[PDB]
Design a protein around this ligand. Structure first.
Ligand code: AX0
Length: 288
């Protein structure tokens, strides 16, 4: 408490009904919720939102406050998870964002793996659209000087209308104390998304995010596959020092594997920019 009141963002906590937790092992810090009157022109209208709360140290408060203020600054875009409001007065700190109903893109793809017996849910144009939308979101974040630093399919959320929304672009990443052997409770090894300059030299640019986007492209066109399959972290270190790159996935046209390999060029200036990736993927989508 004793946080400043920002009337542009403050939302009455009694207009929230907190619901079931999100994430896997977060001690009830992020929950689904219903909000009433998030649109002040429809004060009684319900909507589904997501709420993040503390618990907590003085540092924990400052981290969330900083994460909140980052979202305030970055502004709104169709392909990111947008801040909707905050509860800072007369109670616990809440940060309210959009709820993307279908969950993260990795789980979305894996659950959709294949008269229409030969037709799985996911067609090539819709896979390209997913990649294009993420590229557009990332191009927006870069224009606002935001480096994501862990861009991955697990950090892209999918709305009821299959819109991609980049999540956690404003989360603290503790880049100076990453356990490179860390395996998440879902079995993910996040070191597998890190650009070499980040992993080896602790340098991040927008071009490091471009590297991770290449890994994300590979996840899309393997319908949520795990990158560097079967390669433990110790071997990944030596393979990246030798310049190893992932193989072309099955059922993946050369245009897309081409984009992947460009995103993994050693020199960051020889990777495409997000603006170039948007245009390249746009051409593929228009090719139908
Ligand atoms: C300990 C690890 C952990 O916490 N892991 C986790 C992973 C995903 C989600 N998650 N999942 C969805 C989803 O499926 N649809 N829509 C969402 N907004 C979703 C969110 C979500 O909610 C938020 C509310 C406020 C802020 C500031 C950020 C978020 C995020 C990212 C929550 C927790």
């Amino acid at each position: 408490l004793d946080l400043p009141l920002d009337p542009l963002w403050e939302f009455p906590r009694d207009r929230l009904v907190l619901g079931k937790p999100l994430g896997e092992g977060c001690f009830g810090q992020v929950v689904r919720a219903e909000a009433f009157g998030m649109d002040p022109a429809r004060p009684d209208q319900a909507s589904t939102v997501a709420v993040k709360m503390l618990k907590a140290s003085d540092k924990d408060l400052a981290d969330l406050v900083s994460e909140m203020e980052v979202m305030k600054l970055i502004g709104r875009h169709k392909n990111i998870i947008n801040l909707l409001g905050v509860c800072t007065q007369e109670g616990p700190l809440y940060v309210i964002v959009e709820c993307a109903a279908k969950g993260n893109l990795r789980e979305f793809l894996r659950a959709r793996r294949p008269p229409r017996s030969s037709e799985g849910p996911l067609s090539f144009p819709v896979l390209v659209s997913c990649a294009y939308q993420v590229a557009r979101g990332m191009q927006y974040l870069e224009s606002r000087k935001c480096i994501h630093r862990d861009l991955a399919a697990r950090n892209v959320l999918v709305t009821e209308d299959n819109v991609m929304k980049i999540a956690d672009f404003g989360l603290a990443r503790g880049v100076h104390h990453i356990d490179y052997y860390k395996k998440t409770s879902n079995g993910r090894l996040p070191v597998k998304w890190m650009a070499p300059e980040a992993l080896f030299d602790e340098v991040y640019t927008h071009q490091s995010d471009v590297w991770s986007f290449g890994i994300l492209l590979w996840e899309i066109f393997t319908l949520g596959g795990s990158p560097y399959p079967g390669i433990p972290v110790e071997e990944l270190f030596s393979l990246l020092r030798e310049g190893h790159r992932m193989d072309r996935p099955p059922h993946c046209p050369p245009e897309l594997y081409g984009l992947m390999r460009e995103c993994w060029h050693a020199a960051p200036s020889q990777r495409p920019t997000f603006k170039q990736l948007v245009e390249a993927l746009d051409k593929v989508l228009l090719a139908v």
